Design a protein around this ligand. Structure first.
Ligand code: NA
Ligand code: NA
Length: 327
DNA sequence: CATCTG
DNA sequence: CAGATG
């Protein structure tokens, strides 16, 4: 956790690079298990040889660790942190809509920057375009003080369209958190579930409303059960307009809300622990359901949940307020 | 995993 | 349809 920190860090840099710049999924993946294992490792790695001793730890990595341990640096890391091409790719990638793949193409065409991008808006697709338009706004965290305003809006409009809708804003927003990265809304309705054959309107109706009133500004992606967009808290009495924010809306069959809801609320750490306990308690849990574990090895059969309560209860645990859902 | 692009 | 992005 700090005893093999550098090592794990460099290793991650390395891993990252393989995958983003070179295409080296293998390699990339190589650095990963490597960092994972050293990461758990209980002692002060004092040399390569020592490390090699670990699994996932081969000769090349060991080499690397030596140099790094031998000197505060590593040539290769040295070379990569410079290289404009490598740099460019890490940057282009910041645009929502541009992945590594794309980042590669673009550079090989000479687009290496923001201006490059504006100049070549033609080559970008709609998502990518938006991404570019809101480059700044998108990188700006979302303060709770805004979150609550947003939330206040979304829930009121959902309410109007149908009393039966049920919306929840998961995320750390839900776990307390002072600011957040984007707004995540879990959606359901009684008239939609597991078996119930579809109802796309269910999602589209709301989406519309939200744009009705202009809370929703652009559509990133809009499918039948997942909508990816851009919203914005109306600028008050003109002088201070708000940054454009990412927002997602997703339909969930009622029969599987809370697991989902539980799930999205995190933290990842909370999940796992709960997850493992469920396991002890003779259970199974994932995104959509909680199942009674048979002994034969495995087994299923969706236990029935009416709230986040039903779940814990099942695994016979202490109901946890979202705030304490931390780890 | 769901959506998009081409 | 593969293949990319979130
Ligand atoms: Na991106
Ligand atoms: Na292939």
């Amino acid at each position: 956790e700090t005893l093999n920190g550098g090592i794990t860090d460099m290793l991650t840099e390395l891993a990252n690079f393989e995958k983003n710049v070179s295409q080296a999924i293998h390699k990339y993946n190589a650095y990963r298990k490597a960092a994972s294992v050293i990461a758990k490792y209980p002692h002060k790695i004092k040399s390569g040889a020592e490390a090699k001793k670990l699994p996932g730890v081969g000769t090349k990595i060991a080499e690397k660790i030596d140099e790094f341990l031998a000197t505060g640096k590593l040539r290769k890391l040295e070379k990569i942190r410079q290289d404009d091409t490598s740099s460019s790719i890490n940057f282009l990638t910041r645009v929502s809509g541009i992945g590594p793949s794309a980042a590669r193409k673009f550079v090989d065409e000479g687009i290496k920057t923001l201006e490059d991008l504006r100049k070549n808006e033609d080559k970008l697709n709609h998502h990518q375009r938006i991404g570019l338009k809101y480059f700044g706004d998108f990188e700006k965290r979302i303060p709770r003080e805004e979150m609550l305003q947003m939330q206040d809006i979304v829930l009121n409009e959902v309410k109007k369209v149908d009393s039966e809708y049920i919306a929840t804003v998961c995320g750390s927003f839900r776990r307390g958190a002072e600011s957040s990265g984007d707004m995540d809304v879990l959606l359901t309705h009684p008239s939609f579930t597991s078996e119930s054959t579809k109802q796309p309107k269910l999602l589209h109706q709301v989406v519309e409303q939200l744009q009705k009133v202009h809370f929703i500004t652009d559509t990133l992606s809009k499918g039948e059960t997942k909508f990816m967009g851009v919203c914005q808290l109306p600028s008050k009495n003109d002088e201070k307009e708000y940054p454009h924010r990412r927002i997602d809306i997703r339909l969930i069959p009622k029969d599987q809300y809370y697991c989902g809801v539980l799930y999205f609320t995190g933290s990842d750490i909370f999940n796992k622990n709960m997850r493992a306990h469920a396991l002890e308690k003779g259970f199974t849990i994932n995104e959509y359901t909680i199942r009674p574990l048979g002994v034969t090895g495995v087994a299923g059969e969706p236990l029935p949940v009416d709230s986040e309560k039903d779940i814990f209860d099942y695994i016979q645990w202490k109901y946890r307020e979202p705030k304490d859902r931390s780890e």
